[PDB]
Scaffold this active site. Structure first.
Site, PDB file in Angstrom:
ATOM      1  N   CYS B 106    -108.773  79.379  19.174  1.00 43.15           N
ATOM      2  CA  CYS B 106    -107.834  80.153  20.230  1.00 43.15           C
ATOM      3  C   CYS B 106    -107.627  79.319  21.439  1.00 43.15           C
ATOM      4  CB  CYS B 106    -108.826  81.409  20.357  1.00 43.15           C
ATOM      5  SG  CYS B 106    -108.022  82.352  21.304  1.00 43.15           S
ATOM      6  N   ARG B 109    -108.291  81.224  25.303  1.00 46.28           N
ATOM      7  CA  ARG B 109    -109.537  81.617  25.715  1.00 46.28           C
ATOM      8  C   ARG B 109    -109.780  81.636  27.124  1.00 46.28           C
ATOM      9  NH1 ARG B 109    -113.236  77.609  22.546  1.00 46.28           N
ATOM     10  NH2 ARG B 109    -111.238  76.605  22.301  1.00 46.28           N
ATOM     11  N   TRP B 278    -102.676  88.928  22.944  1.00 51.53           N
ATOM     12  CA  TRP B 278    -101.186  89.045  22.950  1.00 51.53           C
ATOM     13  C   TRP B 278    -100.556  87.704  22.353  1.00 51.53           C
ATOM     14  CZ3 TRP B 278    -103.769  89.632  27.758  1.00 51.53           C
ATOM     15  CH2 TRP B 278    -104.032  88.217  28.651  1.00 51.53           C
ATOM     16  N   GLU B 283     -95.945  81.844  17.648  1.00 51.19           N
ATOM     17  CA  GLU B 283     -96.945  82.234  16.411  1.00 51.19           C
ATOM     18  C   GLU B 283     -95.604  82.990  15.530  1.00 51.19           C
ATOM     19  OE1 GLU B 283    -100.707  84.226  17.000  1.00 51.19           O
ATOM     20  OE2 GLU B 283    -100.270  84.293  19.220  1.00 51.19           O
TER      21      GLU B 283
HETATM   22  C1  HEM Z   1    -104.988  86.903  25.214  1.00 51.74           C
HETATM   23  C2  HEM Z   1    -104.031  86.427  24.314  1.00 51.74           C
HETATM   24  C3  HEM Z   1    -104.628  85.244  23.356  1.00 51.74           C
HETATM   25  C4  HEM Z   1    -103.848  84.588  23.161  1.00 51.74           C
HETATM   26  C5  HEM Z   1    -102.465  84.162  23.901  1.00 51.74           C
HETATM   27  C6  HEM Z   1    -104.346  83.979  21.861  1.00 51.74           C
HETATM   28  C7  HEM Z   1    -103.741  82.927  21.213  1.00 51.74           C
HETATM   29  C8  HEM Z   1    -104.166  82.582  19.882  1.00 51.74           C
HETATM   30  C9  HEM Z   1    -103.344  81.824  18.956  1.00 51.74           C
HETATM   31  C10 HEM Z   1    -101.965  81.172  19.042  1.00 51.74           C
HETATM   32  C11 HEM Z   1    -104.033  81.556  17.853  1.00 51.74           C
HETATM   33  C12 HEM Z   1    -103.461  80.939  16.617  1.00 51.74           C
HETATM   34  C13 HEM Z   1    -103.037  81.983  15.822  1.00 51.74           C
HETATM   35  C14 HEM Z   1    -102.530  81.420  14.452  1.00 51.74           C
HETATM   36  O1  HEM Z   1    -102.292  80.164  14.157  1.00 51.74           O
HETATM   37  O2  HEM Z   1    -102.902  82.135  13.599  1.00 51.74           O
HETATM   38  C15 HEM Z   1    -105.232  82.331  18.126  1.00 51.74           C
HETATM   39  C16 HEM Z   1    -106.393  82.346  17.130  1.00 51.74           C
HETATM   40  C17 HEM Z   1    -107.358  82.870  17.351  1.00 51.74           C
HETATM   41  N1  HEM Z   1    -107.943  83.584  18.466  1.00 51.74           N
HETATM   42 FE1  HEM Z   1    -106.938  83.914  20.072  1.00 51.74          FE
HETATM   43  N2  HEM Z   1    -105.478  84.416  21.241  1.00 51.74           N
HETATM   44  C18 HEM Z   1    -105.658  85.589  22.311  1.00 51.74           C
HETATM   45  C19 HEM Z   1    -106.654  86.817  22.409  1.00 51.74           C
HETATM   46  C20 HEM Z   1    -107.929  86.582  21.399  1.00 51.74           C
HETATM   47  C21 HEM Z   1    -108.870  87.560  21.304  1.00 51.74           C
HETATM   48  C22 HEM Z   1    -108.822  88.733  22.150  1.00 51.74           C
HETATM   49  C23 HEM Z   1    -109.711  86.992  20.534  1.00 51.74           C
HETATM   50  C24 HEM Z   1    -111.040  87.600  20.245  1.00 51.74           C
HETATM   51  C25 HEM Z   1    -111.833  88.727  20.929  1.00 51.74           C
HETATM   52  C26 HEM Z   1    -109.122  85.903  19.965  1.00 51.74           C
HETATM   53  C27 HEM Z   1    -109.836  84.996  19.079  1.00 51.74           C
HETATM   54  C28 HEM Z   1    -109.239  83.992  18.452  1.00 51.74           C
HETATM   55  C29 HEM Z   1    -109.798  83.735  16.918  1.00 51.74           C
HETATM   56  C30 HEM Z   1    -111.047  83.776  16.410  1.00 51.74           C
HETATM   57  C31 HEM Z   1    -108.755  82.928  16.344  1.00 51.74           C
HETATM   58  C32 HEM Z   1    -108.561  82.032  15.277  1.00 51.74           C
HETATM   59  C33 HEM Z   1    -108.145  82.867  14.169  1.00 51.74           C
HETATM   60  C34 HEM Z   1    -108.072  82.301  12.766  1.00 51.74           C
HETATM   61  O3  HEM Z   1    -108.910  81.458  12.645  1.00 51.74           O
HETATM   62  O4  HEM Z   1    -107.000  82.701  11.878  1.00 51.74           O
HETATM   63  N3  HEM Z   1    -108.047  85.628  20.716  1.00 51.74           N
HETATM   64  N4  HEM Z   1    -105.599  82.700  19.215  1.00 51.74           N
HETATM   65  N1  LIG Z   2    -102.612  85.762  19.493  1.00 51.68           N
HETATM   66  C1  LIG Z   2    -103.419  86.098  18.577  1.00 51.68           C
HETATM   67  N2  LIG Z   2    -103.259  85.636  17.510  1.00 51.68           N
HETATM   68  C2  LIG Z   2    -103.690  85.614  16.184  1.00 51.68           C
HETATM   69  C3  LIG Z   2    -103.181  86.825  15.265  1.00 51.68           C
HETATM   70  C4  LIG Z   2    -101.785  86.369  14.819  1.00 51.68           C
HETATM   71  C5  LIG Z   2    -101.631  85.148  14.269  1.00 51.68           C
HETATM   72  N3  LIG Z   2     -99.888  84.710  14.430  1.00 51.68           N
HETATM   73  C6  LIG Z   2    -101.592  85.380  12.787  1.00 51.68           C
HETATM   74  N4  LIG Z   2    -102.370  84.188  11.936  1.00 51.68           N
HETATM   75  C7  LIG Z   2    -102.668  84.583  10.325  1.00 51.68           C
HETATM   76  C8  LIG Z   2    -103.875  83.727  10.106  1.00 51.68           C
HETATM   77  N5  LIG Z   2    -103.516  82.545   9.092  1.00 51.68           N
HETATM   78  N6  LIG Z   2    -104.659  86.932  18.792  1.00 51.68           N
HETATM   79  N7  LIG Z   2    -104.689  87.791  19.610  1.00 51.68           N
HETATM   80  O1  LIG Z   2    -105.652  88.516  19.381  1.00 51.68           O
HETATM   81  O2  LIG Z   2    -103.897  87.833  20.686  1.00 51.68           O
END
Ligand code: HEM
Ligand SMILES: N=C(NCCC[C@H](N)CNCCN)N[N+](=O)[O-]
Ligand code: HEM
Ligand SMILES: C[C@H](O)[C@H](O)[C@H]1CNc2nc(N)[nH]c(=O)c2N1
Ligand SMILES: C[C@H](O)[C@H](O)[C@H]1CNc2nc(N)[nH]c(=O)c2N1
Ligand SMILES: N=C(NCCC[C@H](N)CNCCN)N[N+](=O)[O-]
Ligand SMILES: [Zn+2]
Lengths: 410, 407
Positions: B106, B109, B278, B283
């Site tokens: 992520c 973070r 968000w 993405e």
């Molecule tokens: C506040 C906004 C956030 C942004 C901008 C953000 C952005 C991202 C992005 C760009 C990815 C990659 C998505 C993909 O390629 O599928 C990602 C993955 C991930 N994020 Fe964040 N994130 C946010 C919030 C969160 C929250 C609230 C959590 C958990 C409480 C979180 C947990 C994770 C995890 C575990 C992954 C990896 C998921 C996977 O392996 O498919 N994210 N995030």
């Molecule tokens: N920004 C976030 N991204 C993760 C979920 C959305 C991704 N575009 C979908 N990825 C599918 C897993 N291969 N999560 N978020 O909680 O903000």
């Protein structure tokens, strides 16, 4: 053991067995991955096993494994090692070894071309002037008036570590970098330190934005010597844009011949510290990295301004827009001057085909995803979606400390 | 050992010791790096609980206190007697925020500590889950001013009473296989979309049909629910210069909400823990819209831009990629829906890394996932060496339910 790699765009799954023959370490442990880390005298004892491994691989490649030629060669080398502590490679083994170091270079996306490598044997070389002559012949041959040909020139191997042959340049051709007292940089910021060494050694720098650096050559462990590559041999391309007539006014140009010269070629335990090699450029190397890296020419702004993009907020993606046009310019200019170059779409598509072919004919293709994926438009290139396994096979191209940090001056 | 990570653009070197506390395997070995691979008992429980509680009390400056020892013994006795235990609300919140803190993939973070945790541990049915989810969606959407949140349903017991959200994300578009052989809607969800049909849902057979929630409580079979349309915020995608862009009929939802992962805290496992934050622009614009296996819209956009698609070297795909991404960001910002571009997001992560290094001794990060799918090297993370390792609490992948559910 078998290892599966999957392409998440095609569902194509490949199986790797080649990694079983991987001996060298990777830097990673079962508790930590160092996959994004840039860089994480032998004894008779550990030399024959390395020689044997190589010769077995060599003789197996020519379908002569177990032959009398193979057995005699092993005994010949064994005796030579015990007799002289080292051994000399036959010309055939040298060519085979050089090609395979390229074939095994996990960070190279252009490996589909590995079998077509012109190997120049410069092991009879004894002086810097001799090295210069060899290098000039390499540049002229490889350049081939714009129709680039892959080549490598191999100087004498390491003996006692005190008589190394080294090309102090990181690339045979690069532009000088100059740190200005005001802190700004003229030319290529990446070559400032090397440029200072050249000046110190006597080079009269024209202090321009694109001055071709002189060769600093070290033969037989002696102090390096300066040589200017004949200008008529250094092919360059003025960069212009197909639609933006003002682009040419940016005064940009680049050399057509990419020639890494600071790596060490290891073959059968032997170490070739001076082994300059060249192929041809993938557009992004210049358009994205050399030109747009903040620590390189960093032309993004100036290009963005000329395009009159909204540079008030990153969310307008002005950097991204300017980046594309610049890369369009590089490709356009090279193709226009009939100088070999390949775009990242073609190169990555080719690498995937190469990779799949390698899994089938060799049981694998060590690849470093971090390096293979282009520095722009990553996911719209097939490699982004391709899982890869990174491991080290020999023969290989290895990094070695910069010579100025280890050389004992005479 | 004490590992160091260097940023080749700024020469800044950071030392990582946090990795020395890693416990889980990475998939790599001294002979092979699997860095680009997407998916590499009471006796087992107390050590995990102990590890967690220790770090928890350490985080609240009460390490080695009576409260610490007391709690440790209480949970100890609880595990011995109940074969499991219950986290205090405080421990639950701490664990959830840290699972995010430890998500090496992520890039957002830097926002980790502001997570709103909804304790749904008292939930017992699918309607209850639907209610909790609706509340999460409405809360997180916040009329467009998105707020990060996670809703935590009951922890695992005997594996036969697991709570699970079958959707991969609370909000996604359906995908249908057409006679043409082509795919209508989002190809990524074709299978799930069918399991909805195969379960009762009445698919509108559209290009952008908000799928229905398939909720599973106490191991029981999952039930469908239509998220109140008024709760699902969507953004029509138009370009700030290409008036023809709107004709593509493209739109996306504003709430990214992963709902298929497993939250692990102190050995306890929460199989249903949908979370949301968000979107980072790429993405949607790069992956959802341009991936060949997704909406794959590059050609259509290229044609309408009238650029030479004859040769790859004209970089038409790249040129069009940028426009599609400028449009996505433009549409979201225009409708006042939170979204972050890859430049800003990556800048934030670098800052976050530095904070983490000087405040916790490191930050597990997966370069392969952190670097945006477009313009990689013009973002700072590209030049940032990163060490990837697994820490707990954590978010783990888990088998899709329909491949383990016994109806
Ligand atoms: C506040 C906004 C956030 C942004 C901008 C953000 C952005 C991202 C992005 C760009 C990815 C990659 C998505 C993909 O390629 O599928 C990602 C993955 C991930 N994020 Fe964040 N994130 C946010 C919030 C969160 C929250 C609230 C959590 C958990 C409480 C979180 C947990 C994770 C995890 C575990 C992954 C990896 C998921 C996977 O392996 O498919 N994210 N995030
Ligand atoms: N920004 C976030 N991204 C993760 C979920 C959305 C991704 N575009 C979908 N990825 C599918 C897993 N291969 N999560 N978020 O909680 O903000
Ligand atoms: C035919 C043209 C070739 C193309 C298109 C090609 C392309 C590339 C590119 C794009 C890189 C990344 C460069 C960087 O980011 O710094 C690279 C790296 C590499 N290539 Fe190739 N290559 C070609 C020929 C060769 C040849 C002739 C050899 C050796 C015989 C070779 C050996 C390597 C090695 C060892 C690396 C990694 C170098 C490093 O770690 O700095 N390549 N190549
Ligand atoms: C830190 C990170 O490993 C570093 O910036 C790498 C990433 N990928 C790369 N890929 C290529 N081809 N060339 C490079 O110099 C790099 N630099
Ligand atoms: C094979 C490779 O691991 C795969 O395509 C990865 C690369 N990097 C990624 N990065 C992010 N953020 N999201 C992804 O889905 C991927 N896919
Ligand atoms: N295409 C090649 N690329 C590698 C050399 C050129 C690189 N852009 C320069 N890398 C500088 C070290 N960080 N090599 N070649 O032989 O064709
Ligand atoms: Zn690894």
């Amino acid at each position: 053991r078998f290892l599966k790699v999957k392409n998440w765009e095609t569902d194509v799954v490949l199986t790797d067995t080649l990694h079983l023959k991987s001996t060298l370490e990777t830097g990673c442990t079962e508790h930590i991955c160092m996959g994004s880390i840039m860089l994480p005298v032998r004894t008779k004892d550990q030399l024959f096993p390395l020689a044997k491994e190589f010769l077995d691989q060599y003789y197996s490649s020519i379908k002569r494994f177990g032959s009398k030629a193979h057995m005699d060669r092993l005994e010949e080398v064994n005796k030579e090692i015990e007799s002289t502590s080292t051994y000399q490679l036959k010309d055939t083994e040298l060519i085979y070894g050089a090609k395979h170091a390229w074939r095994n270079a996990s960070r190279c996306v252009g490996r589909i071309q590995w079998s077509k490598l012109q190997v120049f044997d410069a092991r009879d070389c004894t002086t810097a002037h001799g090295m210069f002559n060899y290098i000039c012949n390499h540049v002229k041959y490889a350049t081939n008036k714009g129709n680039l040909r892959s080549a490598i020139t191999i100087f004498p191997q390491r003996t006692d570590g005190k008589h190394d042959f080294r090309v102090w340049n990181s690339q045979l051709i690069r532009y000088a970098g100059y740190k200005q007292p005001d802190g700004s940089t003229l030319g290529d910021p990446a070559n400032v330190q090397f440029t200072e060494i050249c000046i110190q050694q006597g080079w009269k720098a024209p202090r321009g934005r694109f001055d071709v650096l002189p060769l600093l050559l070290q033969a037989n462990g002696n102090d390096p010597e300066l040589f200017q590559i004949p200008p008529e041999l250094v092919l360059e391309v003025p960069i212009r844009h197909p639609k933006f007539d003002w682009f040419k006014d940016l005064g940009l140009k680049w050399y057509g011949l990419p020639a890494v010269s600071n790596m060490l070629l290891e073959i059968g335990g032997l170490e070739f510290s001076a082994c300059p090699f060249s192929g041809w450029y993938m557009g992004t190397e210049i358009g994205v990295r050399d030109y747009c890296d903040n620590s390189r020419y960093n032309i993004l702004e100036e290009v963005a301004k000329k395009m009159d993009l909204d540079m008030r907020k990153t969310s307008s993606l002005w950097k991204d827009q300017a980046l594309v046009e610049i890369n369009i310019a590089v490709l356009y200019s090279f193709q226009s001057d009939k100088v070999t170059i390949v775009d990242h779409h073609s190169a990555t598509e080719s690498f995937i085909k190469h990779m799949e072919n390698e899994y089938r004919c060799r049981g694998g293709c060590p690849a470093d995803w971090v390096w293979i994926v282009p520095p722009m438009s990553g996911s719209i290139t097939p490699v982004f979606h391709q899982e890869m396994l990174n491991y080290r096979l020999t023969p290989s191209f290895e990094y070695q400390p910069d010579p100025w940090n280890t050389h004992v001056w005479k």
